[PDB]
Design an enzyme around this catalytic site. Structure first.
Site, PDB file in Angstrom:
ATOM      1  N   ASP A  13     -29.571  66.705 -91.062  1.00 41.89           N
ATOM      2  CA  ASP A  13     -30.277  66.295 -89.787  1.00 41.89           C
ATOM      3  C   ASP A  13     -30.844  64.965 -90.064  1.00 41.89           C
ATOM      4  OD1 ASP A  13     -30.350  69.026 -88.604  1.00 41.89           O
ATOM      5  OD2 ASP A  13     -31.998  69.600 -89.539  1.00 41.89           O
ATOM      6  N   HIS A  66     -35.127  73.893 -89.491  1.00 39.06           N
ATOM      7  CA  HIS A  66     -33.922  73.358 -89.147  1.00 39.06           C
ATOM      8  C   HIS A  66     -33.166  74.375 -88.292  1.00 39.06           C
ATOM      9  CE1 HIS A  66     -30.065  71.849 -90.676  1.00 39.06           C
ATOM     10  NE2 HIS A  66     -29.481  73.043 -90.923  1.00 39.06           N
TER      11      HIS A  66
END
Lengths: 313, 306
Positions: B158, B186
């Site tokens: 990410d 996450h």
């Protein structure tokens, strides 16, 4: 300090998937060298290529200046200095070798014409996709004299690395100490894996060992039996090694196997073939190492001559 | 000798992308030999033998040894680094509680194995989802044998996606961009944050970062693999080698003693610097922005049976 333009064909395939992050991280042209990737595959693969491009972006690679994806070889090769030719017609059930060569001739004629039309003058080409030697010959001849014959090669480095590793495991030594195996001839089952000049440190390998050819020739099929899929990781690693040694040089005392144009070779092999030989590389240029053999090569020479005839060459 | 590195889920696509990067030196640097210990489920053993064969065929000078196994205790024996890519395969319309319980089974067994046989100072990163909660399960199942500061979850994919997006939006090279932050879980509740990001020396975004994984699946028909492998290497490399001066990277880390008032007892992504194998949370980079991700991590902790 402009980014070096590198084309990869077959870029939606598994070798391409394993190869592009190595190029982008600096494994090909070095950790200081910016690169631009030009990715080619067939028109139905455009969406898959966009996916590869998106993943490359998501790596945040500092050296990767630009990625271009395309189905047009005239776009892919535009201004490129390095072309790694993974794309090829895959062998289907029922094909003889001749059938595979005939399916591939069209591909490599179009690509060789495109490279000659639009690539940089000094472009260096390595063919990975099979039949690699003949595909490279077709590519070269399709350029109609416009491509330096010393700058078109075919990859035997996967077979070479397989043989280094096998010899290391047979001797029980680190592979880092093993050098100078030789794969002669065609990238096929007629290849001649040769350990007669191989050393461990500086010791002739024979002196350190207390099926070899069959295991090297059969290793690709073994990978398929185990994985259900052809080698990809290891092929990509070998393609990087082939190019890296070519561009940056082979280290002192080391030669590596490369399929190179046979005119003027020191072994009396017939002219006009792409033929794997032991090579040093210095200043971006291969040189065949002499004195390392000839009847040993008759079958692979004959097969390469047969394929060249089949190529309409 | 060689640093022993375990990779779970080693027959999957992330594993396939990851192990040649480790073997070539990208994890631990150009002078550090590695031994790879590859774990996957028993039905994947033939596939693992194929991965081992391909690794051999690379003739990697730093790769001293490869072992393949379906036994976690064999995989983790003596290991200093464990990269946990394996997780429970997520089924069509599966309940989130059920998924967490099934992952808890895997990560409890793996945590117990790490505690039993890994090196005392073993460093763990969990990649397989749900990464933060899986990491928490692993840590808690090790019943003290694992330093809580040595169990992490990966938000680096990410983070790298956010660096790339910011560079694309600003029309600059990604090498010029740093110090995006991914806060929290996450998952879709991650908070991608550009408030502290720098371009050079100079001080739709959220939806795009959150949606990126689904975009890759639309284009490729398969989840990210290459990029996730690369991020795993970056997460461990930066942890061990250290982050350069002025750089912070996102890492899911144990939340006790954090400077942001996030609740204790979680694996939570924070901006971190690293030095010689140790992370430090960077303070002052925010708090109500985190409430939803906090609540999701607490819910997942409870649903996992922890």
């Amino acid at each position: 300090m402009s980014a070096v333009k590198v084309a990869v064909t077959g870029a939606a395939g598994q070798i391409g998937y394993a190869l592009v992050p190595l190029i982008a991280r600096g494994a090909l042209l070095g950790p200081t060298t910016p690169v631009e990737l030009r990715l080619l595959d067939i028109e139905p693969a455009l969406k898959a290529l966009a996916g590869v491009e998106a993943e490359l972006e998501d790596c945040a690679f500092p050296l990767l200046d630009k990625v271009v994806v395309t189905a047009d070889p005239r776009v892919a090769f535009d201004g490129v200095a390095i072309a790694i030719m993974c794309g090829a017609f895959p062998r289907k059930a029922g094909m003889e070798r001749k059938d595979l060569l005939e399916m591939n001739a069209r591909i490599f004629k179009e690509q060789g014409e495109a490279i000659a039309a639009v690539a940089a003058s000094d472009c260096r080409v390595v063919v990975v996709g099979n039949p690699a030697n003949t595909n490279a010959l077709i590519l070269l001849k399709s350029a109609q004299g416009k491509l330096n014959p010393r700058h078109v090669t075919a990859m035997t480095r996967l077979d070479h690395n397989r043989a280094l590793s096998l010899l290391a495991r047979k001797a029980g030594v680190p592979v880092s100490q093993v050098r100078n195996v030789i794969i002669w001839g065609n990238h096929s089952s007629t290849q001649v894996p040769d350990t007669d000049s191989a050393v461990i440190g500086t010791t002739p390998a024979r002196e350190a060992i207390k099926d070899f050819v069959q295991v090297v020739r059969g290793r690709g099929a073994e990978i398929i039996q185990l994985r259900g899929l052809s080698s990809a990781m290891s092929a990509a690693k070998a393609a990087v090694d082939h190019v890296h040694d070519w561009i940056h040089g082979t280290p002192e005392g080391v030669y590596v196997s490369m399929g190179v144009y046979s005119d003027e070779n020191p072994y009396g092999v017939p002219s006009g073939l792409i033929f794997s030989f032991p090579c040093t590389c210095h200043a971006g240029e291969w040189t065949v190492v002499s004195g390392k053999l000839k009847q040993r090569l008759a079958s692979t020479i004959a097969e390469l001559q047969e394929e060249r005839a089949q190529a309409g060459l």
